Amino acid sequence: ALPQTVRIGTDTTYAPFSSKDAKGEFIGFDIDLGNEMCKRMQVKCTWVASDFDALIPSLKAKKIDAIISSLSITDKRQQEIAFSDKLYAADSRLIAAKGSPIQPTLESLKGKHVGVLQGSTQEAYANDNWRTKGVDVVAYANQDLIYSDLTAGRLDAALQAEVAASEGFLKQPAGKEYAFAGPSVKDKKYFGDGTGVGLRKDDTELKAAFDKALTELRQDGTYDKMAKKYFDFNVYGD
Ligand SMILES: NC(=[NH2+])NCCC[C@H](N)C(=O)O
């Protein structure tokens, strides 16, 4: 009972996972994964762009059928929605101006303005640990606004996925003056364990079909060859 067309929501402002090229086409590792899974599922798929914080609400409202948007698999989210098996890992890390003394600690970030994606696990962490304790945490509709406000000096630092920042900003023209500030931050509760396809809890058949296609594309080496387009390391993690 899979839909004739699976509607997949994604936030196209998170290179190299999900973004738009110059003529508006969806590109990145999430898009590649989704399209490959849809192929093996033998279903048509329609990509739907949305701000990140609108994805889970759109899913719950059945305006989309799935989310592939670096969606972290967390205990909290598992109470509202279901997930496919892990698509890849996604650690979190701060960036700031090169040579910045900033570390991902309250003491370091006091007085600093820190940008986070609204609706993200990074926002959850930053709100609880930093915002409550006086740090000017600013939440943004999308990650592109964060990068812009950073380079415009409205932000001192920003918290997002390590790989997104690296491949999508630090290794891009806009980020040549910026670097990681401190190590990545582990936090079981807030950050979860990898990303997955977000799905409605009752769509058992759809989850089975994604899980099946995902295992198959990992079995035959397609995952690693697709990954190699973007990463020279183990993006899957454990
Ligand atoms: N396409 C995106 N904007 N992805 C952002 C994901 C941020 C983080 N992994 C989360 O699940 O909250």
Side-chain angles (χ1 to χ4, degrees), residues 15-16 95 98 147 162-180 228-233:
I95 54 177
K98 267 171 190 182
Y147 292 142
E162 183 180 17
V163 177
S166 186
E167 301 296 333
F169 182 69
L170 300 178
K171 293 173 61 167
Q172 301 297 317
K176 301 302 286 184
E177 306 176 75
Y178 297 86
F180 284 126
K228 206 168 156 181
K229 187 178 196 177
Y230 311 97
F231 321 111
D232 48 31
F233 58 86

Side-chain angles (χ1 to χ4, degrees), residues 125-177:
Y125 180 93
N127 277 3
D128 172 26
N129 289 284
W130 300 339
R131 191 182 117 74
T132 65
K133 305 295 174 300
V135 184
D136 185 28
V137 173
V138 192
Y140 289 81
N142 71 68
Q143 183 71 35
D144 280 344
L145 298 159
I146 305 187
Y147 292 142
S148 295
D149 264 21
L150 186 64
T151 66
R154 277 185 204 91
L155 293 178
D156 300 318
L159 187 60
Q160 58 286 302
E162 183 180 17
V163 177
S166 186
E167 301 296 333
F169 182 69
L170 300 178
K171 293 173 61 167
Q172 301 297 317
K176 301 302 286 184
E177 306 176 75

Side-chain angles (χ1 to χ4, degrees), residues 10-15 17-19 30 50-53 55-56 68-74 77 83 88 90-92 117-124 141-143 160-161 164 190-191 194-195:
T10 193
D11 167 17
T12 60
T13 59
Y14 219 68
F17 297 104
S18 174
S19 63
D30 280 352
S50 149
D51 282 352
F52 183 79
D53 70 342
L55 288 166
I56 290 180
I68 306 176
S69 199
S70 296
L71 190 67
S72 290
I73 310 174
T74 71
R77 280 169 183 165
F83 289 88
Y88 47 82
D91 297 339
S92 297
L117 173 70
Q118 192 169 259
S120 73
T121 52
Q122 290 87 11
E123 180 192 38
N142 71 68
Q143 183 71 35
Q160 58 286 302
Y190 283 110
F191 292 144
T195 63

